[PDB]
Design a protein around this nucleic acid. Structure first.
Ligand SMILES: Nc1ncnc2c1ncn2[C@@H]1O[C@H](CSCC[C@H](N)C(=O)O)[C@@H](O)[C@H]1O
Ligand SMILES: [Zn+2]
Length: 454
RNA sequence: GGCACGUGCU
């Protein structure tokens, strides 16, 4: 048949959503990491199931003219920048094409124009949050990253796609942790203290939250450590602790503590102040997220009498940025620390017509329906699993004219759009936005409406 | 190998 270590010549014909590398050998589809369309390779077979996968490039016979040859990127490719080996112009085209192909294949839609993916002018150094594991390598505490489905620390200081100030803070903390003899975590032994660093920095404000993810609550001399990090980075307004005593892949455990300062940072979006807790969600590309939100707000054509639902509201960024131009805003968020942020953020921006609830989107929608709230627009911003059929049905029963769907996954978006079409909402506009350059993640704004005029 | 309600997308 074909055996688990064979070398065979193959032509790469397509890219998967995740940035492999599609070939056909014998009868089977193979996924090859770091292989682009139009390339001819010798492929080393890693794994043979029926009727899929998986190979590795042994040799390039012909390379793609769109391949980025940067060796520094090539080390990041599996961990940080999934698509860094493809040129930026082709990353955008690839993301546009995926949206088109999803709407066609899954929802039957071919009659609607999908705009060209809106790209970032300087598609680098954009992330406002870093999550970095801390491990012992050759008896020395090292920071870096993990590759896909691996737990072997790849040392790294320059993360390519994050705020260089965050890189500096991580390195400074790495060196400080060494100077205070704090032991790093070891997954094999379950020994040590420091598991992870999470560092968030406001894109406009520059304010920094450091999170130390530890196995135990007591961190010897941590207050003296903090005094010194604050001295080199006065922008740090918050140092949090998160305790994770389990042996799991999850970064955070249940318990949070405040070690210094506040339990939030403040950053600006669309000219408003937002407080952001450690466990709350905040878009990591603040620049492009503004364009994403502005796109959705423009799609919605909000007027002074509109009633908006901001579902999957987070810290209230979308809803609060429109509440002064609108009659009422109703929002729902699952994470309590984010809902508490959104309530404070309303007060903070002198907003009196926002109503945030801590629930599941689906049974908040059900409550608002039973309470007789009459929304005219529904803004949704779900995670990758999309909306539940229960939410879609319920949102539609309100009779809201416009729905503005912000997606981070085209497969689930297209599924949900299909059901909205069945319920009388026509897909009107689609604008992909590149929130995560150099990665496989695609972000889309869709406008669905039941008005023939839009 | 992953993902979405024993096949559907990747
Ligand atoms: N079933 C659910 N109901 C309500 N919120 C949910 C949820 N599942 C996930 N969430 C939350 O929904 C958000 C998805 S990301 C969007 C957040 C926000 N609109 C912003 O862009 O800033 C996160 O805040 C996540 O914690
Ligand atoms: Zn994805």
């Amino acid at each position: 048949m074909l055996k688990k270590n064979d070398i065979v010549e193959v032509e790469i014909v397509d890219l998967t959503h995740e940035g492999a590398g599609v070939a056909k050998v014998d009868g089977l589809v193979f996924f090859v990491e770091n292989a682009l369309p139009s390339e001819k390779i010798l492929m080393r077979v890693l794994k043979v199931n029926k009727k899929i996968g998986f190979g590795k490039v042994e040799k390039y016979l012909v390379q793609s003219p769109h391949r980025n040859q940067d060796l520094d990127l090539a080390y990041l490719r599996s961990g940080i920048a999934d698509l860094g080996h493809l040129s930026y112009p082709e990353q955008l085209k690839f993301k546009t094409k995926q949206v088109k192909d999803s709407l066609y294949k899954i929802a039957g839609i071919a009659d609607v124009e999908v705009a060209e993916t809106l790209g970032m002018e300087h598609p680098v150094k954009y992330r406002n949050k870093a999550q970095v594991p801390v491990r012992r390598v050759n008896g020395v505490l090292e920071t870096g990253f993990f590759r896909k489905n691996s737990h072997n620390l790849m040392p790294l200081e320059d993360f390519f796609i994050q705020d260089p100030v965050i890189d500096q803070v991580v390195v400074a903390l790495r060196d400080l942790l060494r100077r205070f003899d704090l032991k790093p975590y070891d997954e094999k032994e379950q020994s040590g203290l420091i598991r992870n660093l999470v560092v968030r920095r406001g894109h406009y404000s520059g304010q920094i939250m450091v999170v130390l993810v530890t196995t135990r609550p007591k961190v010897f001399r941590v207050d003296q450590l903090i005094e010194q990090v604050i001295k080199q980075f006065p922008e740090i307004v918050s140092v949090m602790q998160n305790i994770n005593d389990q042996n799991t892949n999850a970064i955070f455990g249940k318990e949070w503590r405040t070690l210094y300062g506040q339990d939030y940072i403040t950053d600006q979006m669309l000219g408003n102040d937002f407080q952001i807790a450690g466990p709350a969600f905040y878009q990591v590309n603040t620049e492009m997220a503004e364009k994403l939100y502005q796109t959705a707000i423009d799609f919605a054509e909000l007027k002074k009498d509109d009633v908006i639902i901001d579902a999957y509201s987070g810290i209230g960024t979308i809803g609060l940025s429109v509440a002064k131009h609108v009659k009422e805003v109703y929002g729902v968020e699952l994470i309590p620390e984010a809902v508490e942020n959104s309530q404070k953020n309303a007060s903070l921006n002198k907003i009196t017509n926002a109503h945030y609830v801590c629930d599941t989107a689906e049974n908040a929608m059900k409550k608002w329906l039973k309470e007789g709230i009459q929304p005219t627009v529904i803004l949704v911003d779900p995670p990758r699993k999309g909306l539940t059929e229960s939410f879609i049905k319920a949102s539609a029963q309100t009779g809201a004219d416009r729905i503005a769907y912000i997606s981070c996954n085209v497969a689930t978006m297209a599924r949900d759009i299909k059901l909205y079409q069945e319920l009388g909402y026509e897909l009107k506009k689609v604008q992909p936005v590149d929130l995560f350059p150099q990665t496989h993640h695609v972000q889309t704004v869709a406008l669905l409406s039941k008005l023939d005029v839009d």
